[PDB]
Design a protein around this ligand. Structure first.
Ligand SMILES: CCCCCCCCCCCCC/C=C/[C@H](O)[C@H](N)CO
Lengths: 243, 240, 111, 285, 114, 41
């Protein structure tokens, strides 16, 4: 009566039977823009059922020798669904997110992931020059739908050690107790609205801490999906198409 | 006008003092605030968040393997699994937590602590693990029948996966200067050995090593006193 | 950068002292951790090279008490007090601050 | 009667804290079903096993102070943020783009928080580079973004028609001003992901990455007031004290050494650990 | 803990040699592997290093375009060498080991020679 | 509690804060667990 939970947004529910709990990020629900904050003087065009539903990304494989993966939000939705056709026409943007990571296993496997949400996530270059100087490419700072791999998971590509990285919102995926993790993030940004294509707010991270071990004979391909979904999103400021 | 003699203290520049100074822009109204979630008000809402210790800080482990303690099915009982100190502000395992990075900006900590363990093993494997703690004065304990004198919590694996030892505040002084050496060994605080209680029993065709992740935090009566300037910084240039 | 071992041929007598030095260098204190590296290396003429004093002063395990080495700035010395019948190889100095890692020339011993 | 479906709070609660928390006594428990020690760290919330529920404790009235940990008293100490070198007799003046990312003692503190908002307070200590300290006149302008940066020792930007300026000697006690909050956003931000413009961004070396435009705050220019060119070398040491500060969204602290001013690079050839190594795992000291 | 290279074979101008080694006795996905050559009666030279997990090849600038490394996951190195040999490169090619998180000293163990 | 100029940012440090609420960083869960119960039940 506390494990089983069904989340239903829009027209696409998600049921699960071995969950743990639901984590709000910094204790505040995602809400609309009150009129002491808004600075645009044109009416925002908020849809309700078209762009508030769970979109499923592509599933990475988890092996013996894996390092990590990371995505950037809301970069990953700029090509799929109606939300990909309302972040190209409209200049401004404002939303929340509601993440979900499935990874199921048997009873004789072991291992544990770490699902976090890091606001304002900057990727840093990896070269010992002081001026030319190395810089990350465009296919690394905005990976797209797939999401690249970490090169150094111990320092998170930023010189921040992993052991201190529970100050962010997070849940564990411990493969003996649960098999799904859920974070609900409100809208954290300085200016009230935001551009939608350049300023990507935050970034999901999955880092396997205790690596996968299994005895001989079990199934060897354990995949990992993501299921995100916006909440209370509103747009504004129409123009022509720029991808 | 009014007669006013001066004092020592004239014409100095003390850094940590708060006085007024003449503004440069008369009649300035700043850009107004909006509601942004997750506001801090103190640095005691950042000492109460459990982060990951670095216990396996030995010669042969490198990388993500440093963060976790290994267990395995022993041949005998009574054996030892890991051991470390309680000194936020001494080199060792506490240097990679938020307590160990904030209690180096300050001197003279106080109050309790807590250590949370999490077991990342399989599902069908059980066991028990004593978790001891002993106040200072002697060396590291030898066998288990000596380390069951101090504070200890016997922990059993099951559907739950966490026990949280609360290391109490047993000290003569009201604070502890958070530095070690020869003359400052008067402010040390003892060892947190993990002992096997019985064994680690495993069914057939199941992996034969599990990994215990240790964590760490601070309790509710945690206070800090004197702001100093830290020592983990490194520079020899101007960052050109 | 570059290194210059100052004595390419030092000819000591047993129960004597040595001073093999590389005067020529850059600042060589960078990599920004402090920690100027400057490792030393024997090479007996039939085997692979081996370690010696690994930072400016610290000894590596297995190295005897005779191998002493110090220095600062751009001056670095080795001092061994009893040249035995084993300490006869070639001495190299390896810096590790900047990116192209350089080993310097070398230093012989013959008596 | 019309279309029907058109018609169709937080968790935290603030508590004042004056002292540290107290401790209420307890006794021994011999009872099944009420277990406070067992937790679940998978749910993300930290444990809450207070020590009244583990061990038998005594009633302790606590009187320690929790005044010197709030962030107003934590940042209100002034540290170095910049050094301007001045050689005369060979252009005559010197500039310094305002950027507090340079010196590492105050950079490492201000990266604990993501979005900040304060009011600075500067102080300019100026010495000749051989401890002479002879009386001259100095002028410190302040060029906001857009005004022309002065080109010569005696061009016509040095007239101070609009923008501020501080005349002070070398023998007086050092100057001090109080710069207010000057950002077009709602708050300063230190970490800005995302390119600043539109267009198409290359693959090899995009040096535009992560440059936040909400912090480009101008230039600080200084010359020596004379007609004849005097012959002297100087340094200034601009200190900065923050006050009235408010912060948001904490994040962990840098652990690797720094390499550049604007960009947060590390060096992946040699990575330093956090904890220095010991001999084995089964011994303490 | 041993590093066992390949047997020495002489090659004339216009081929590759692909000298290997095999890490024996430790965890192979936790160490760099450098490559150091010894000119005849002369000084040592550094070539470059391969990181055993995440790739991350780095050379000198005196050896770019030649001696492009590879990597194997079955406990084996790049086994790689120059594509275009000259007459002077009849040297001896060592291989070494370096800990990932730094221990403040490089090049602890050494290999054989070709 | 005194200010000699007619602007508000030129003053000294203001009054003490004395407030904190750590429940938005320790326990931000929906189903609020208590101290004396099994948290996965
Ligand atoms: C006579 C007064 C001359 C000095 C006037 C300096 C005014 C500019 C100070 C504004 C506050 C500092 C500028 C912003 C702070 C950091 O550098 C940026 N946030 C960098 O991200």
């Amino acid at each position: 009566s506390d494990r089983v939970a069904q989340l239903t947004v829009g027209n696409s529910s998600i049921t699960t039977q071995e969950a743990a709990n639901i984590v709000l990020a910094y204790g505040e629900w995602p809400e609309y823009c009150p009129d002491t904050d808004a600075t645009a003087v044109d009416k925002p065009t908020r849809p309700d059922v078209s762009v508030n539903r769970f979109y499923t990304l592509d599933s990475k494989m988890w092996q013996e020798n894996s390092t990590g993966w990371y995505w950037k939000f809301p970069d990953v939705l700029n090509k799929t669904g109606v939300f990909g056709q309302n972040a190209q026409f409209h200049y401004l943007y404002r939303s929340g997110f509601c993440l979900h990571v499935q990874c199921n296993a048997s009873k004789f496997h072991q291992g544990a992931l770490l699902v976090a949400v890091i606001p304002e996530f900057v990727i840093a270059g990896r070269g010992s020059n002081t001026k030319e100087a190395p810089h990350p490419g465009f296919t690394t700072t905005f990976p797209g739908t797939t999401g690249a791999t970490f090169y150094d998971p111990y320092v998170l590509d930023s010189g921040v050690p992993l052991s201190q990285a529970l100050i962010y919102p997070h849940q564990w995926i411990n493969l003996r107790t649960n098999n799904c993790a859920t974070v609900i993030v409100p809208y954290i940004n300085a200016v009230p609205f935001d551009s939608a294509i350049n300023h990507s707010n935050f970034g999901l991270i999955v880092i396997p801490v205790s690596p996968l071990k299994y005895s001989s004979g079990a199934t060897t391909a354990i995949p990992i999906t993501i299921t995100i979904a916006p909440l209370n999103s509103e747009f504004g400021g129409l123009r022509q198409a720029v991808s | 006008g009014i007669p006013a003699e001066l004092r020592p203290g004239t014409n100095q520049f003390l850094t940590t003092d708060d006085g007024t100074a003449a503004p440069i822009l008369p009649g300035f109204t700043p850009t107004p605030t909006i509601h942004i979630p997750g506001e801090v008000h103190s640095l005691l809402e950042l000492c109460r968040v459990e982060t990951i210790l670095e216990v396996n800080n030995t010669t042969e482990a490198t990388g993500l393997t440093r963060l976790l303690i290994p267990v395995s099915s022993q041949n005998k009982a009574d054996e030892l699994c890991a051991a470390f100190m309680v000194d936020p502000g001494r080199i060792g395992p506490w240097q990679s937590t938020l307590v160990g990075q904030i209690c180096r900006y300050y001197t003279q900590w106080s109050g309790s602590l807590k250590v949370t363990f999490m077991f990342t093993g399989s599902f069908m494997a059980t066991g028990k693990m004593l978790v001891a703690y002993s106040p200072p004065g002697s060396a590291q304990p030898a066998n288990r029948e000596t380390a069951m004198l101090g504070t200890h919590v016997i922990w059993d694996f099951g559907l739950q996966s966490s026990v949280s030892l609360v290391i109490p505040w047993i000290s003569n002084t009201h604070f502890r200067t958070a530095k070690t050496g020869g003359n400052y060994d008067y402010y040390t605080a003892g060892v947190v050995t993990l002992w096997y209680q019985t064994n680690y029993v495993v069914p057939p065709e199941t992996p034969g090593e599990a990994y215990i992740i240790a964590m760490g935090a601070a309790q509710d009566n945690f206070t800090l006193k004197i702001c100093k300037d830290t020592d983990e910084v490194t520079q020899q240039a101007v960052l050109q | 950068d570059v290194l210059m071992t100052q004595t390419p041929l030092s000819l000591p007598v047993s129960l004597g002292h040595q001073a093999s030095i590389s005067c020529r260098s850059s600042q060589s204190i960078v990599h920004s951790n402090g920690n100027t590296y400057l490792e030393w290396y024997l090479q007996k003429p039939g085997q692979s090279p081996k370690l010696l004093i690994y930072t400016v002063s610290n000894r590596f395990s297995g190295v005897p008490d005779r191998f002493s080495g110090s220095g600062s700035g751009t001056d670095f010395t080795l001092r061994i007090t009893s040249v035995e019948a084993e300490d006869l190889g070639v001495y190299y100095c390896f810096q590790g601050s900047h990116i192209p890692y350089t080993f310097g020339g070398g230093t012989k011993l013959e008596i | 009667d019309p279309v029907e479906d058109i018609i169709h709070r937080a968790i935290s609660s603030a508590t004042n804290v004056e002292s540290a928390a107290n401790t209420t006594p307890s006794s021994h428990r011999l009872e099944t079903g009420r277990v406070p020690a067992l937790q679940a760290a998978e749910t993300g919330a930290t444990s809450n096993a207070t020590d009244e529920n583990m061990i038998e404790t005594r009633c302790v009235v606590n009187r320690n102070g929790v005044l010197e940990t709030t962030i107003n008293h934590f940042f209100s100490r002034s540290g170095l943020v910049g050094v301007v070198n001045l050689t005369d007799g060979t252009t005559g003046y010197a500039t310094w783009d305002i950027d507090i990312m340079g010196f590492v003692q105050l950079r490492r503190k201000c990266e604990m928080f993501t979005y900040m908002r304060f009011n600075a307070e500067f102080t300019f200590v100026t010495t000749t580079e051989n401890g002479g300290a002879r009386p001259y006149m100095l002028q410190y302008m302040y060029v906001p973004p857009g005004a022309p940066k002065p080109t010569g020792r005696d061009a016509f930007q040095w007239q101070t028609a609009t923008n501020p300026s501080v005349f002070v000697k070398l023998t007086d006690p050092p100057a001090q001003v109080s710069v207010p909050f000057m950002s077009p956003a709602s708050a300063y931000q230190w970490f800005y992901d995302g390119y600043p413009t539109f267009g198409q961004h290359p693959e090899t070396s995009n040096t535009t990455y992560g440059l936040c435009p909400n912090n480009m705050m101008g230039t600080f220019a200084v010359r020596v007031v004379s007609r004849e060119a005097s012959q002297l070398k100087l340094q200034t040491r601009v200190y900065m004290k923050l006050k009235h500060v408010r912060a948001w969204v904490p994040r962990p602290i840098r652990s690797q050494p720094y390499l550049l001013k604007n960009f947060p690079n590390y060096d992946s050839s040699k990575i330093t650990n956090s904890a220095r190594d010991r001999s084995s795992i089964k011994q303490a000291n | 803990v041993q590093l066992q290279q390949s047997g020495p074979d002489l090659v004339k101008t216009g081929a590759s040699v692909r000298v290997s080694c095999r890490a024996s006795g430790y965890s192979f996905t936790s160490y760099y592997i450098h490559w150091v050559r010894l000119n005849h009666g002369k000084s040592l030279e550094w070539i470059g290093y391969i990181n055993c997990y995440n790739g991350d090849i780095t050379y000198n600038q005196k050896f770019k375009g030649k001696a492009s490394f590879t990597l194997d996951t079955s406990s084996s190195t790049a086994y790689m060498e120059f594509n275009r040999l000259t007459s002077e490169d009849s040297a001896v090619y060592y291989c070494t080991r370096e800990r990932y998180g730094t221990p403040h000293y490089h090049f602890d163990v050494w290999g054989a020679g070709p | 509690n005194i200010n000699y100029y007619k602007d508000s940012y030129a003053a000294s440090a203001t009054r003490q804060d004395f407030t904190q609420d750590p429940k938005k960083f320790t326990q931000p869960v929906l189903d609020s667990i208590r101290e004396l119960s099994a948290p996965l039940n």
